[PDB]
Ligand binder design. Structure first.
Ligand SMILES: O=C1CSc2cc(C(=O)N[C@@H](Cc3ccccc3)C(=O)NCCc3cc(Cl)ccc3-n3cnnn3)ccc2N1
Length: 236
């Protein structure tokens, strides 16, 4: 996350770090706990992943440096990628991980709610992007979970800035007109969480952007409310 600020333990308890272990262990992507056995994340996270065997999901993590070889994790039983996914920029950048076991929820691992039935027309004014990605275009995975508050831009404005892509109703955009704060490399799959009536909703999934925190170039996210039927279909 560019222009962001460090988080404290317990603060984003739905944020997971998804690790690949092939050929060596490293943070691959972020993700959100949406069910006891279910993580929501981005499809482009699995571009080089041979199978779920190599994946570890860590929850309750503030610092990447807490992950030692005795640190508990959740195996991934399944990666359900949307059948229409091809590449991030062309939408459908959504994926569920079915964990091998049920997360017992604690102070440090909690579910984030999906956007709610009847809230299609809520205007979300308190939205945050979280993750351990870069702080600039050429940087490194950060040790401490970063956070930045970012305003939603309308899909009409978002199309004016990305006239070489098709920005659809199944995408949601978020960024400052003068840049400065945004997601970046390694933040993919993570949440754009928004609080409405003091409840947090999983509004977005970090997908793609032209550079990081560039002015007039907003972050583009998978619009989760448009995939709720898909999510339920697949999680039932
Ligand atoms: O130990 C390491 C070495 S550094 C590292 C980088 C990435 C990475 O490139 N992630 C990409 C996604 C990706 C996943 C799999 C294969 C290839 C790429 C990403 O986050 N991409 C984030 C996309 C993005 C989203 C928004 Cl909302 C705004 C701006 C950006 N931009 C970041 N860079 N340019 N734009 C993932 C894990 C990593 N762990």
């Amino acid at each position: 996350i560019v222009g962001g600020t460090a988080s404290v333990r317990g603060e984003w308890p739905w944020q997971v770090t998804l690790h690949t272990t092939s050929p060596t262990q490293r943070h691959l992507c972020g993700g959100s706990i949406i069910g006891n056995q279910w993580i929501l994340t981005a499809a482009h996270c699995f571009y080089g992943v041979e199978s779920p065997k190599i994946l570890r999901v860590y929850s309750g993590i503030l610092n990447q440096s807490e992950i030692k070889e005795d640190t508990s994790f959740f195996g991934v039983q399944e990666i359900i990628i949307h059948d229409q996914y091809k590449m991030a920029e062309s939408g459908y950048d959504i994926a569920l991980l079915k964990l091998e076991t049920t997360v017992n929820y604690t102070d440090s691992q909690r579910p984030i709610s999906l956007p709610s039935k009847g809230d299609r027309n809520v205007i979300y004014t308190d939205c945050w992007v979280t993750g351990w990605g870069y702080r600039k275009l050429r940087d490194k995975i950060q040790n401490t979970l970063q956070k930045a508050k970012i305003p939603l831009v309308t899909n009409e404005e978002c199309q004016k800035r990305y006239r070489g892509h098709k920005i659809t109703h199944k995408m949601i955009c978020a960024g400052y007109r003068e840049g400065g704060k945004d997601a970046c490399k390694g933040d993919s799959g993570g949440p754009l969480s928004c609080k409405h009536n003091e409840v947090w909703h999983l509004v977005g999934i970090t997908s793609w952007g032209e550079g990081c925190a560039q002015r007039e170039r907003p972050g583009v996210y998978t619009n989760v409310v448009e995939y709720v039927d898909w999510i339920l279909e697949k999680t039932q």
